[PDB]
Amino acid sequence: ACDYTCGSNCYSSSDVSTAQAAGYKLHEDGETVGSNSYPHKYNNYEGFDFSVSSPYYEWPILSSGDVYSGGSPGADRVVFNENNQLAGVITHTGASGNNFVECT
Numbered sequence: 696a697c698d699y700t701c702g703s704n705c706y707s708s709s710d711v712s713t714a715q716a717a718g719y720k721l722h723e724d725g726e727t728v729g730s731n732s733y734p735h736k737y738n739n740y741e742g743f744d745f746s747v748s749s750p751y752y753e754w755p756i757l758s759s760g761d762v763y764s765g766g767s768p769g770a771d772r773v774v775f776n777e778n779n780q781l782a783g784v785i786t787h788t789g790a791s792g793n794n795f796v797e798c799t
């Protein structure tokens with residue numbers, strides 16, 4: 696069973712934690728990875744009703760289970776804040792253009 700489902704992608708809590716930790720570290724260190732420079736601010740144009748407070752940061756979560764290190768970031772992301780709290784898991788999959796939808 697999946698803790699989070701993004702399109703056809705199945706994620707467990709552990710996957711999420713592993714990814715969040717990686718992105719948060721980078722965020723702490725003032726460093727980024729990839730041509731799109733992750734992690735980076737997440738504005739929330741979508742208007743999701745997160746339980747955690749802003750500001751938000753986006754970091755890719757891979758279907759492979761590997762931690763993001765460059766190249767295609769795929770369509771899934773984990774969204775975290777300054778306190779390292781999980782805001783949510785979102786995806787471009789099944790979303791119009793470059794918008795996002797929440798994973799279920």
Ligand SMILES: Nc1nc2c(ncn2[C@@H]2O[C@H](CO)[C@@H](OP(=O)(O)O)[C@H]2O)c(=O)[nH]1
Nearest residue numbers: 731736737738739740741753772793794795
């Ligand atoms: N759709 C969306 N993109 C955002 C937001 N905040 C910043 N962006 C950046 O604008 C880019 C346009 O989609 C997004 O790319 P991403 O695919 O790299 O995650 C994202 O990185 C937001 O709230 N919504």
Ligand SMILES: [Ca+2]
Nearest residue numbers: 706707710760
């Ligand atoms: Ca997994």
